[PDB]
Amino acid sequence: MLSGLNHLTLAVSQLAPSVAFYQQLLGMTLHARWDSGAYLSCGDLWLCLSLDPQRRVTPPEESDYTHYAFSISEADFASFAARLEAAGVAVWKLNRSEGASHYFLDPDGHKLELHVGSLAQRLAACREQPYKGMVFF
Amino acid sequence: MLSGLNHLTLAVSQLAPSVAFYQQLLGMTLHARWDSGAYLSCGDLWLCLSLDPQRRVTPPEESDYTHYAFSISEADFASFAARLEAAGVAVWKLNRSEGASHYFLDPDGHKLELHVGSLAQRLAACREQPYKGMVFF
Ligand SMILES: CC(C)c1noc(=O)[nH]1
Ligand SMILES: [Mn+2]
Numbered sequence: 001m002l003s004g005l006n007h008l009t010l011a012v013s014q015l016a017p018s019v020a021f022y023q024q025l026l027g028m029t030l031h032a033r034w035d036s037g038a039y040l041s042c043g044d045l046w047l048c049l050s051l052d053p054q055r056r057v058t059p060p061e062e063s064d065y066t067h068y069a070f071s072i073s074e075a076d077f078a079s080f081a082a083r084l085e086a087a088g089v090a091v092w093k094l095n096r097s098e099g100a101s102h103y104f105l106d107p108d109g110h111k112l113e114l115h116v117g118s119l120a121q122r123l124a125a126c127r128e129q130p131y132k133g134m135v136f137f
Numbered sequence: 138m139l140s141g142l143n144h145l146t147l148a149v150s151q152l153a154p155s156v157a158f159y160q161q162l163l164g165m166t167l168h169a170r171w172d173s174g175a176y177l178s179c180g181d182l183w184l185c186l187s188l189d190p191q192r193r194v195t196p197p198e199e200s201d202y203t204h205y206a207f208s209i210s211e212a213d214f215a216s217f218a219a220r221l222e223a224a225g226v227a228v229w230k231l232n233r234s235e236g237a238s239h240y241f242l243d244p245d246g247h248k249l250e251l252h253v254g255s256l257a258q259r260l261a262a263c264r265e266q267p268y269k270g271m272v273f274f
């Protein structure tokens with residue numbers, strides 16, 4: 001069977017600013033870089049940044065809702081979000097429709113999120129405040 | 138500090154075929170569904186399918202290299218690839234890297250991959266045969 005996410009690969013238009021964003025600003029661990037990419041980890045996540053001449057810097061109104069959320073503790077969430085805000089990181093969403101989340105953009109407009117809580121916790125919250133038509137299995 | 142990938146959210150144009158693809162074809166566990174989305178799990182991965190009228194069914198030549206790889210064992214790889222082939226699922230790339238990989242498209246053109254092997258395995262291979270310009274940290 002399939003057992004989870006092996007890796008996330010993001011196409012990037014400029015490798016150095018993207019490496020700096022994920023490593024310096026978001027605090028991910030940089031393991032290797034080469035002329036056309038980089039490998040980082042975020043806990044158990046394997047992140048690949050791949051230099052792609054096809055990647056465009058995409059405003060959030062032009063892309064769909066596909067997005068990548070990273071886990072952060074309740075204790076660290078607000079100060080990390082505020083630090084991104086103070087650093088000028090662009091946002092893409094404000095309404096918290098799926099719990100405690102901060103929605104921000106990477107240098108190419110990849111839609112990112114800081115989120116506090118697991119799937120189990122989200123399902124429990126949804127039982128009390130369900131999305132319209134929601135059914136649980 | 139970020140501790141991992143919290144969830145992956147894919148924008149989908151039609152919820153029913155996307156649920157069928159991820160749950161029935163790919164074998165992921167469906168935990169909940171509502172009028173505009175679904176929550177599934179695949180090992181530790183929390184996957185959200187979000188119904189989005191802005192999602193275009195996107196040919197692979199028209200999207201960048203951003204992609205999502207799922208883990209599978211070497212022993213299970215060939216039969217899973219054959220399942221996708223029997224189902225007529227399109228391939229967007231041939232494998233030319235270390236570790237088995239099958240590159241396939243979801244119903245909306247999201248670029249997916251089955252991959253065998255960890256970041257540690259990839260780094261070990263790269264240390265022996267570094268990519269052009271490769272530096273390790
Ligand atoms: C760019 C290449 C070395 C790669 N590594 O992981 C990927 O998904 N692509
Ligand atoms: Mn989210």
Ligand SMILES: [Mn+2]
Pocket residue numbers: 007009204206250
């Ligand atoms: Mn890959």
